[PDB]
Design a protein around this ligand. Sequence first.
Ligand SMILES: O=c1ccn([C@@H]2O[C@H](COP(=O)(O)OP(=O)(O)OP(=O)(O)O)[C@@H](O)[C@H]2O)c(=O)[nH]1
Ligand SMILES: [Cl-]
Ligand SMILES: [Cl-]
Ligand SMILES: [Mg+2]
Ligand SMILES: [Mg+2]
Ligand code: NA
Length: 326
Amino acid sequence: MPAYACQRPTPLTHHNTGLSEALEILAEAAGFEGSEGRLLTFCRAASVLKALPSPVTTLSQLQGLPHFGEHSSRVVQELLEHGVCEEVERVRRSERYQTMKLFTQIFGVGVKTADRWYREGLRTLDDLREQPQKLTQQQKAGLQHHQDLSTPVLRSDVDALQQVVEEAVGQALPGATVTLTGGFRRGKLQGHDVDFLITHPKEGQEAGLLPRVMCRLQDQGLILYHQAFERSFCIFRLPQPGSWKAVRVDLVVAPVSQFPFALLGHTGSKLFQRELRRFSRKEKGLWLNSHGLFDPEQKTFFQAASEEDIFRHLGLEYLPPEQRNA
DNA sequence: CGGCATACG
DNA sequence: GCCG
Ligand SMILES: O=c1ccn([C@@H]2O[C@H](COP(=O)(O)OP(=O)(O)OP(=O)(O)O)[C@@H](O)[C@H]2O)c(=O)[nH]1
Ligand SMILES: [Cl-]
Ligand SMILES: [Cl-]
Ligand SMILES: [Mg+2]
Ligand SMILES: [Mg+2]
Ligand code: NA
């Protein structure tokens, strides 16, 4: 079991779901309390269990597994012995956890904003609606559409949205392409949004593209909210039987030279990308982001034609998106 | 002990 | 919280 999540395949479904969910509760709570380090350890330990080939049944099976020390091992032991971990249950039913979860799940509300509102005494969505002077326009949008945005996006929803994005993209710049990324590219059957990556085969033609896309979508009445730019975090109007629902849609534009890096960077998982960037820097001395891969000694960028190129650059076995579910 | 991913809106 |  290698130490970095990018060094091992992680399927979407696995053999330790209950154990990983418990550890991810503690990771989420650690983040709510400002401890990025503890969040990462608990996320990594959870991901190790996702990568195992069969269920953990005994504590001895944790020996030698990376990122399992006293705390994470204690959590797993209690779950194996009693089917429940007291620390996890205490977090679950704590007012702090439940409110930070409710608040951060809002589009436009992060941990720092949620924490301040918590300290000010706010607890519910109606508490926020009852004081709208304190909200940004983005947060007003996230709060107005909160109910729809709390409904899982389905794979059927994805196909319809890609068609309308392609239509708008085709008018905005003929020959431009739309690639599904994010969790649905990793094989998820549901999601909190739909993520797309847009490019054009002739380097440079993608410049200025996204404003032209957004203006056309807005003209077709399909944009319930959006902000030169190359990323947009929007809320789309998605038709439904006799009605419609709001759906979060992310659009990213990249030049074709950077497309492999942007595809890798936006396909995830979030933990997979963090681990891959950490691996690249700490083990290989290379700086990775969604634009490229930089050698800070030679002051050069690696040219990649594919995700396969990037894995090979970093000396890692290639992992298809479906195996990046760290 | 230091480190913990990344850049755009 | 854990790794090196
Ligand atoms: O903090 C973050 C968030 C996102 N991302 C990058 O953006 C991608 C999309 O980020 P999303 O937030 O849309 O997550 P997701 O598609 O993986 O899962 P859903 O909750 O949407 O179902 C991620 O998969 C990752 O590549 C990061 O690198 N860091
Ligand atoms: Cl590998
Ligand atoms: Cl770390
Ligand atoms: Mg997504
Ligand atoms: Mg997204
Ligand atoms: Na949020």
